[PDB]
Design a protein around this ligand. Sequence first.
Ligand code: VAA
Ligand code: ZN
Ligand code: ZN
Length: 862
Amino acid sequence: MDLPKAYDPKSVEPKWAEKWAKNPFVANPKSGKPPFVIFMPPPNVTGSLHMGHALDNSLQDALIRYKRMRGFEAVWLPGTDHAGIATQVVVERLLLKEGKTRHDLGREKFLERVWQWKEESGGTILKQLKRLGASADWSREAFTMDEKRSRAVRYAFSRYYHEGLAYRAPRLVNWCPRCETTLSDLEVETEPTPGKLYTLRYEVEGGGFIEIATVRPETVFADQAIAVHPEDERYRHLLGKRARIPLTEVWIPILADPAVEKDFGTGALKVTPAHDPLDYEIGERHGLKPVSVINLEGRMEGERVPEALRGLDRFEARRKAVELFREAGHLVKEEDYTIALATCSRCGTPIEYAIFPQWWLRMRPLAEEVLKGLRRGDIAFVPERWKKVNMDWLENVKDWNISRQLWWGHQIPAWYCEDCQAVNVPRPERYLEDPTSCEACGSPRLKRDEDVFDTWFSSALWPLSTLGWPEETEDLKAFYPGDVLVTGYDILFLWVSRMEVSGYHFMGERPFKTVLLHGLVLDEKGQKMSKSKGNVIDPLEMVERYGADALRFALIYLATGGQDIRLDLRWLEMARNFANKLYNAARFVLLSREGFQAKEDTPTLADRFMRSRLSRGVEEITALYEALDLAQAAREVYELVWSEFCDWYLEAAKPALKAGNAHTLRTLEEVLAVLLKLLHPMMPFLTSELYQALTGKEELALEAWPEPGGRDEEAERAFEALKQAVTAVRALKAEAGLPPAQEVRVYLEGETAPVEENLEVFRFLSRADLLPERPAKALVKAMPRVTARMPLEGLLDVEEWRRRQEKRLKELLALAERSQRKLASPGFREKAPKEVVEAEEARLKENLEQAERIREALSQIG
RNA sequence: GGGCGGCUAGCUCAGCGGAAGAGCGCUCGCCUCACACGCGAGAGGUCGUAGGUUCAAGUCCUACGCCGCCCACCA
Ligand SMILES: CC(C)[C@H](N)C(=O)NS(=O)(=O)NC[C@H]1O[C@@H](n2cnc3c(N)ncnc32)[C@H](O)[C@@H]1O
Ligand SMILES: [Zn+2]
Ligand SMILES: [Zn+2]
């Protein structure tokens, strides 16, 4: 230890960080010690980490460390997700376009430049986690697209397909013409946008009118029906007729369908299964063949589509589409409208729809496999308000498009016969094998589905791929049911649920026993932090500024009840300052046991007191940990250390140490040890350094959690008396306007036994000597247990003392009032605890006793 | 159209059945021999509104007001 005046994290954290880095706390399946597993949500290989991750891992670590030094096999599996679509963009964008030109460099040369990036990003994400003191079993650092993990999927899929649950069909997909790939519902965002609702109307079989309000004119040629509410007979007895469609000679049928909102626009809507979910939905509800007018390039084309219209853009198609309607006489009511435009969450551009042959996943059945457990009580949720939010998500899911046209992910394992047009999917038992001859036409000429899987598909496969489950390992046998899953609600659906499935399905069990959802950190402005919003702060920028233990402590302190966390540097200071205080407290004890000269070894009230108040702490804090409530423990320990050890104990011991009392210096050393234990999970670095310098022990991390020892009742009530006498005098001087150091003689009344026995402390702390004889005239301070009378010797600020005391009375009588009322209240005396009542009765007894004391003094004073 | 979270001291946030709390800021004193990233003494809240349940309600029930999320197929 170097013991300067102030603590410099930079002289400490980096070394310990490296020590822990190069020598991970490797997990042992055969440890024969109860395990504790936590799967680290693998950060996306997109850039660096941000304060969000920090809160996420910092929370995890503190759990690992606690359990570890609590006696378990702390297994925390680290890893990083390739992100798929995400990373894709990142490289494609910035790096490439900016770098020079994304301009297709081949499906190969591109995959190169991506891994290169995967290295930088993946490398950085690790430094960061290391430097934040992540005690992660880096010996098992898994990467979604590493050999061992790629197998977990290629197998998982195969076992799905041949199980039926994974099919291939034309169900329509949300397609982004920017990234040229399909997305999932959860991957597409819909954000209101100013548009133009057009009401078009057209001919009818025999008669003549039908009016329709559509946001997209182009999708008319692809119409297949006019939908009309089933009960809106209203302006609807043209139900069952036909309808030339604007510009065409095509005759669509007017049908009824429950999804028609009679009150929106004209009580009837156009129908286009080939270009929209609602329509496609109703379309198949009455069986109507799909029909495209616009392709994947987002350009017009097709049967119906009119000449001269087929060609250019999808939007520059509606421009002329409208004109060719009004100026042709089919347009009627054009008007503004706030449309719920759907866009690509990761590129912006608005999606589109299309029927395409894709890989889907019968969620309906799976979801039930899971709900089976949840219902039984298999999994526990921290806020607990998420159980329902989870269960309800499953309660109504839709088959998920697993395939993707990205160049990143796992190239799905399906082979298509260039002769029989049949799919060949490796069987589970030989899953690793590549079919070579179509098991249909028996032909050799095969072709593999060059699609790719959904990043979320591999990720949902984690509490298994990290434990080598593509196989049947011992790690997996030793500790599969993770004990606590830590993550922020932002991915409760596309991450947690997904896993709960692949988990409850590929093992008859829960991937984890408890899901701990924490809030999100967000820029001071209140909005979520993410590379997306462009509002991210590198956690290291903060470590460098306040220090890693600080950052860790703030973040945990604030992660109360799954609530979010608004960025507020003030809290970082709060933390740094607390590090420094803890540090100083140690510096004191080290510099004290310096050249100490033992003159005696006598138990002191202060000693007995801190040992007791410590047992209290140890109990309380453990329980808070045993409730995953770190945020609270974080402040319960702040309290203990700062208000009970530094503010009172250390100071109370200063004298005894000058007097060469070994029993005290001993206690200081022993108590400080435990505190360094308690604080370790949150602040590992500083807390280790100190413990080393204090006990010579090299790895606090491996030490055992403290056990609550004593609990001296009287001793605590005794020392309290002292605190009061001390603070009484302190206040008296304050009010009197006397400087701190000013020597003073005062007189005590009441539970004074404590002050008398431990006189030197009282003297040292108050800077006052005791008076044998109660002074005639004097300034008075009334405490709950003791009363102080300060002789009128000297120049004193009586006005202040007066004011201050005139005000205590105002309050003391006010309390007496409340008490009186309660005691004399109906139902309180009777229907209320035989304790909370006799106490309220005692509060009154002494609220008066004090009021009188002041009153009398207050008047007595000239 | 559904659910959910928030609404407590000037600021940022805890507390959720029995006498209103913390950090910072502020007022007054202190370079008191671990710490000025500090020490001591204070000021400052009818806990968003309206109702109830309860002997007892920031703390539970019920509407509502704003703020923000999530899930939704009003074309
Ligand atoms: C399979 C998933 C783990 C996926 N690879 C993924 O979520 N990758 S990530 O980079 O977004 N890391 C997300 C994890 O970090 C948490 N997180 C991300 N942003 C924040 C934030 N602003 N506040 C609090 N927590 C946040 C997520 O809860 C998740 O555990
Ligand atoms: Zn896109
Ligand atoms: Zn074949």
